[PDB]
Structure formats: structure tokens, C-alpha cells
Amino acid sequence: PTLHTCNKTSFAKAFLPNETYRQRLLDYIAIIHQLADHASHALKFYILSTSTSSFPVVHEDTIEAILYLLNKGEAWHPRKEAKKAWRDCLLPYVQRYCQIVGFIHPNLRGEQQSINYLTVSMMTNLKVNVQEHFMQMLLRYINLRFDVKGQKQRLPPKSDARKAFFTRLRYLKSVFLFDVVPELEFLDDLTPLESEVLEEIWSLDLPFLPNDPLAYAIVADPMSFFPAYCKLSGLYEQYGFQRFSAIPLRRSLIQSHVRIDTIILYQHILCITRRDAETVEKDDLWMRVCNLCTKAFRSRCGMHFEGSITTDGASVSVYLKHPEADKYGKVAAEVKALYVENNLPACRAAENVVVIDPNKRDILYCQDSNGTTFRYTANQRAVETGSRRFAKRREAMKEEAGVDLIESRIPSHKTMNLMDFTRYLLVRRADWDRRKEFYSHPAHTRWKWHSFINRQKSESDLISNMRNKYGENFTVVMGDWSDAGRTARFQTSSKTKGWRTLFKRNRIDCFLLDEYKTSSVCPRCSSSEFVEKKFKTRPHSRPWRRREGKIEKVHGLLGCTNPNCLQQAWTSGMRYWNRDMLSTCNMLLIVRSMLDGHGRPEVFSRS
DNA sequence: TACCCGGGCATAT
DNA sequence: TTTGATTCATAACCTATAGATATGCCCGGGTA
RNA sequence: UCCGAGCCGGUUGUCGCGCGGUUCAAUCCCUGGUGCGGGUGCUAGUACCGGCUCCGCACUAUCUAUAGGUUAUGAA
Ligand SMILES: [Mg+2]
Ligand SMILES: [Mg+2]
Ligand SMILES: [Zn+2]
């Protein structure tokens, strides 16, 4: 449920023009940013230092103790036995780490709220990283060891001789995941490559469940997989493969958003005592520094401000909290329901139905029954958003200040070697002041805020153009193709699944549709035999490829060889078509057939 | 010796 | 479907996960 | 290492057409839109009334940190 919402506004409008209050928060967020940055490095340093004997069990108390030790040092006196025990163990390594990086204890007072926010956030990053990229990384390591890519290029594809290898590898995965118990003879028949992989996996001491696979164990107890995840990263570095960030590091020197609530407000901004704060209502207390009459603070859908914002010195994120919130202290069929097949009655009652074919270049390509075509290309989005313009300005500033040269020689932060990590800190410390000053410029934070405004305007203009073109009320049907997470090599990123959320915000229905073979059928003949693909060649469109002399095959242009679609006066011999146009026309036929009750056309049906 | 206040620390499921 | 032909660092664009404050107890320094 | 969108053709519901012609749209400064009135600012001929700009009435817009793939640059 949507129990919270956010309204992002500029720093100047959110806060009153009182200079004292603005300066105090700017200093406060900078201190918290420095504490958060060093805490992540200190946590990694502690793990690497103690990795010589055994991997420690990282908990919430571990990160909280590190934050207090960096701030107050030995001056921190926890009252709980559990926190006191962690303080004693982490104390010898915190002071040594500070000497290496030249860290100076800030001794910030009233840090209780900030430390709790940072401790939970860092623990969140640890859990999320383990859940998402443990099974993926473990299977990735297995493929690299067997050299699947090498065998694919050298061995003949689609042959029964190599299908056995795929079956052999597929069966080994169940043994690796402990889903199927291997036999004694099966272990003996393993090749030295297979035997070595099995021994290495068993060395990770992976948890086991009597009646559930390894994937279920990861969801149930993600934290227990952390010692194995760190050891897996060491195996990647040992064999020279591309390493991965096992431990999240907040290496960014750009001013990050810091959570500010009512307690932080009176302690650091207003600088009033807690006794005086309790005598003033929350709304009256916030009005002294923040203009609650601003449009960003207006209540929406029954949610209220409730005093919770995050700011980075240029943009202020005003959060709206529902009265029924938790007050702190704490699927396959559902996805199928988003498809147009289960949402047919909604389309019938719609004033107009618009089909969209997502593509890498033509992100949105719209067409309706009336034939009014509309498209939202990536070039149009980039110009309106200004990401390309911002990137050039950011690149120019780095070249002028020489920051790119300094950053290029920074060692890998993903390494597990203690000496290499120590060298990484020394190199980072060598020019830390130069990079900190460069990223302290307001442009870096301003670019984030300007991109948000440009993206919001681009989305608003896109909705307005579609409404003018197709009508005030319409229903959008989009192809199910989505390059989510995984992106093809040599191809830029593209927004695929985010359009579903955008249409939901604008109260516009968005229904998925299968794109299987929707670009290989000619609508005029409903045949796929005569469709021609990549028939013509031309010099590569990318400027660096064109200078090299590469030749690309056209993918967006297709033709139909059916004589019925042709005319006697034609000399080309084929009826040319646009790939985006073909998909939208095919989607219209599919949607119309489904609405009429005939279902998906048999030509577009899967095998 | 005893009381007050500001701040440090703990915890909610 | 889609559109193209090995390692590290810094920004971004995208996708996904998790979390998005307040009340009470005590203790030490100062004052009566 | 580069790019806006619309329309007319070569063209025929065709291009990463560095194909030809035409219109406005954005490069600094800006949280965005929607429905009402006013205040007069600009737009059209004698209340007809459409459009841009502010005023304020209320409905709506989910952000932060991290991880992964990719992109741009700097090093191999
Ligand atoms: Mg598509
Ligand atoms: Mg397409
Ligand atoms: Zn045909």
C-alpha cells in the first residue's frame, strides 16, 4: 500500500530565507555525509582485518558501534552489554583506520537520530546486495570456471554432442544447490574440473534446508550468506575474473541527502532545548524554519507532512506520511493480471485504445485505430531531460580541474586484499581534498535537481501530447518486452518498465502485451514467409564505427515479398515497412482480435 | 546533602 | 523480442529492496 | 561519440536515408499538471472568447541509500 509519498522541491522555496538556519543544516548534512562515508570504509576494513581468522557476524549493533567510535571514540559509553561488547572488539581497529586515512573525530553532539538512520540504511544495503546478487553471482562463477563462453564459440552449437554438456551442467547445478543428493559413483565420475568446482562451492559452508532449495534459504535468512558472499569475492579476485562489490561502499563525495526530522530540527537547526520543544506543537515548530504554506507541503490523498524531509543543499524532498503508518519499530498471477488479456473489459469501455511498441531508439511508438501515429524517441527524451548536455558539462569540468586523471589511478575498491585496500585508501587520501573541493561545487547537486525538473516536464509534455493526439481519456497497451536490469552489450540504457508507473501516476491504464513474433508479420497479408530482414547494408551509423569502416545491417527496415502486397508499377520488388510501424499495426490487430473475442491470432501464437 | 536540567543512551513488532 | 559484434576508477540511466521517529530512564555537573 | 518534434515527396502505412523542402520547440533561470473564478498585462473585429502571463480556491504527482547491467570520460 502507498502509505508514504514524497514532494520534491527546491532548497530556496522549502526553507525560510533565514541565513542562520540554512547554514546550520548545511554544516550538519556535511558532517553526516562524512560520517556515513568513513563508516562504510571502516566496516570493510574491520572485516578485511579480521578475515585472517574468521569472518565476523555483522549486525545492526556492529554498524552502530562503528558510527559512535568514529564520532566520539572512547568517549562512547553504551549502557547495553551487547553494544559494550561490540565497542571493545571494534575499538582497536577504528583508531588504526583513522590514522591511515587521517580521519579526525568530529565529536558531534546529539547524533542519536542520525546514527540510527545511517545504521538501518547500511544494514539495508547489506541485505539487499546479498539477496539480489548471491545466486546470480554464484552461477556466474560456475559458468566462468567451466568456460561456457569459450566452449560456445569453439564447439558446434545446436548439436547433440554439446546438448549433453548443457544437460551435464544443468544437472550439476542441482548438486551445487543441494537440491539433489549426488551418488558415490556420480562423485567419482566427476572430471577434475567438475571435482574442483564442487570442492570450492562446499568450502563456502552454504546453509541448507531439509525441504527447500537454496534459493528459498536466501530469502528466509539472507544475512547468514554474508560470510560465504565475501569468500566468493575472494575466489573471483584469485582467478583474475571481474570482481564485484561484495560490501556496499558510500564512496561518492557529492553531498548526499540526509534525513532531517523534528528531533534533529530543534537540536541542531533551532538549537533549542528538548524541554522547550515539547511545549510547542510539531506544526508550529516547523513553521519557524519551513514555509508550510508552500505547495509542496499540501496534503494529498489524506497524507500529511508529519515533519520528515531529506535535503542535500540544493533540493528538498518533502515526505508525506499517512496517519495509518507503522509509527516506526516495524505473485506470478499478479504479474499476469497486468497483461491486456485479463484486462479486456477495461479496453472495451475505453474511449480510445493506443498500442505502444518499446524499442531502444524509439522508446515509445504509439498508434491507434484512427491511424494517428505518435512516437517518443530517445533523442527527444535526451534533449528535454538534458542528460547529454549535463554529461558534457560534467566531463568538461573534470578535464579542466584534472579530476578524471586523479580518479583513473584510484585502485579497485572491490578487492579483498588488505594491502591493496590499504593502498587504495592512501591513494584516495592523497588527493581527497582536491576531489572534495571539486564535488563541493553547487553544480553537481544542481544537476541532480535540474534533471528531476527536466524529466518531470518531459513526462508532463509527453502525457499532454498523447492526450491532445488521442483524446482526454485513453487506455495504453504496451509490449511485454523489457530490458530490465540486464542490458545488451554495446547498447545504451532505455526506460522500459518505468512507463507503467508513469501512466499509473497520470491515471492512465497500462496493459502488457506479448511481443512474440510481432515484428515478422505483414498486416496487409498476415503472412511471415515473405518478410525480409537485414536485406540491405550501409556504413555503420555510429561515428566512431563509421570512421573505422564497419558496415551495419538495417534492422528497422523490413519488406514483404508477397506479390499481393506488391504493384506492377513498382520496381523495388518488395513492399517496405518500418519495424516500429509493423509492431504497432500487428498489436492493433492482436488487440482488436482479443476485443472481438477471437483471441490472439494464430500467426502470432507461440510454438 | 539534595534537587534541577541538559544531554547521553536504550528501544518500540 | 532487440540490435548490435579482457580489468579498474569517476559521473549518469535503468531496475530492484528496504526504509522512511518518538518516548522514557539515568547520570553528572551545577546550584541552593 | 554525434544527434528535437511535426508536415509535404523520392514513397507505397520504408530507414541511425551525414535524402530534398517547410513550421515551432528547447539549450541559461525553473517541483509538474488539472478544474474554477480576478487583474487586467499581451493577443482579434465590432458581450460575442479562443490563446499566452500572473493572482488564489483544491485535486493529484514517491523520495533516499545501496547493489547489478549499460553508457560517457580517464587509464590498461
Ligand atoms: Mg516492442
Ligand atoms: Mg519497434
Ligand atoms: Zn504482405
DSSP-assigned states of every residue in A52-77: TT------HHHHHHHHHHHHTGGG--
At A381, give phi and psi (nearest 5°).
-65, -45
Cα of A415 to ligand 1 centre, how many Å?
40
Q: Which ligand is closest in space to the CA of residue A496? A: 1
Q: Evaluate whether residue A170 is within a structural domain.
A: yes
Q: Is A420 annotated as a binding residue?
A: no
| C-alpha cell belonging to residue A303 | 497524507
Do A141 and A205 lie in a common domain?
Answer: yes
Do A184 and A315 lie in a common domain?
Answer: no
Do A274 and A322 lie in a common domain?
Answer: yes
> Which amino acid makes up residue A132?
E
Which residues is A376 bridged to in the sheet?
Answer: A364
Resolution (A): 3.2
Q: For residue A179, give the DSSP letter.
A: S
Cβ atoms of residues A173 and A142 within 8 Å: yes
CA–CA distance, A539 with A530 (Å, rounded to integer): 26
| Cα–chain center distance at A604 | 33
Do A360 and A216 lie in a common domain?
Answer: no
CA–CA distance, A213 with A177 (Å, rounded to integer): 7
Q: Evaluate whether residue A69 is within a structural domain.
A: no
Do A232 and A185 lie in a common domain?
Answer: yes
Do A547 and A412 lie in a common domain?
Answer: no
Choose the final residue of a domain: A398, A421, A440.
A440
Alpha-carbon distances of A29 from A107, A265, A396, A560, A584, rounded to whole Å: 15, 12, 28, 62, 50
CA–CA distance, A368 with A359 (Å, rounded to integer): 18
| Cα–chain center distance at A16 | 34
Do A326 and A287 lie in a common domain?
Answer: yes
Do A283 and A392 lie in a common domain?
Answer: no
Cα angle A90-A95-A97, degrees, rounded to a multiple of 5: 90
CA–CA distance, A249 with A307 (Å, rounded to integer): 29
Q: Evaluate whether residue A45 is within a structural domain.
A: no
CA–CA distance, A413 with A554 (Å, rounded to integer): 41
Q: Is A359 annotated as a binding residue?
A: yes
Do A358 and A212 lie in a common domain?
Answer: no
CATH number assigned to the domain comprising residue A359: 3.30.420
Q: Evaluate whether residue A79 is within a structural domain.
A: no
Residue recorded with cell 499481393: A564
Q: Is A326 annotated as a binding residue?
A: no
Q: Is A284 annotated as a binding residue?
A: no
Cβ atoms of residues A35 and A108 within 8 Å: yes
Q: Evaluate whether residue A77 is within a structural domain.
A: no
Sign of CA dihedral A256, A257, A260, A265: positive
Q: Evaluate whether residue A96 is within a structural domain.
A: no
Choose the final residue of a domain: A440, A458, A484.
A440
Cβ atoms of residues A38 and A428 within 8 Å: no
Cβ atoms of residues A384 and A461 within 8 Å: yes
The residues whose Cβ lies within 5 A of ligand 1, an ion, are A 357-358, 479, 481, 515
Do A381 and A397 lie in a common domain?
Answer: no
A465-482 residues labelled b (16+ CB within 10 A) or e (exposed): ebeebbeeebbbbbbbbb
Choose the final residue of a domain: A283, A305, A330.
A330
| C-alpha cell belonging to residue A268 | 541542531
Cβ atoms of residues A327 and A49 within 8 Å: no
Cα of A568 to ligand 1 centre, how many Å?
33
CA–CA distance, A414 with A419 (Å, rounded to integer): 13
Q: Return chain A residues 512..571 having CB < 7 Å to nucleic acid strand B.
A: none
Alpha-carbon distances of A20 from A15, A264, A268, A460, rounded to whole Å: 11, 15, 11, 37
- Domain residues for the domain of A589 are 531-604
Do A378 and A410 lie in a common domain?
Answer: no
* Number of domains forming the structure of chain A: 5
Q: Which residue is nearest to nucleotide D17 (CA to C1')?
A: A538
Q: Evaluate whether residue A95 is within a structural domain.
A: no
Cβ atoms of residues A451 and A385 within 8 Å: yes
Q: Evaluate whether residue A22 is within a structural domain.
A: no
CA of A494 to C1' of C14 (A): 7
Which residues is A260 bridged to in the sheet?
Answer: A309
Do A326 and A282 lie in a common domain?
Answer: yes
Instruction: List alpha helices for A51-159, DSSP H.
Output: 60-71, 81-101, 112-132, 135-146, 148-154
CA–CA distance, A313 with A546 (Å, rounded to integer): 44
Experiment type: cryo-EM
CA of A106 to C1' of C28 (A): 23
CA of A527 to C1' of D4 (A): 36
Cβ atoms of residues A591 and A477 within 8 Å: yes
> Which amino acid makes up residue A432?
W
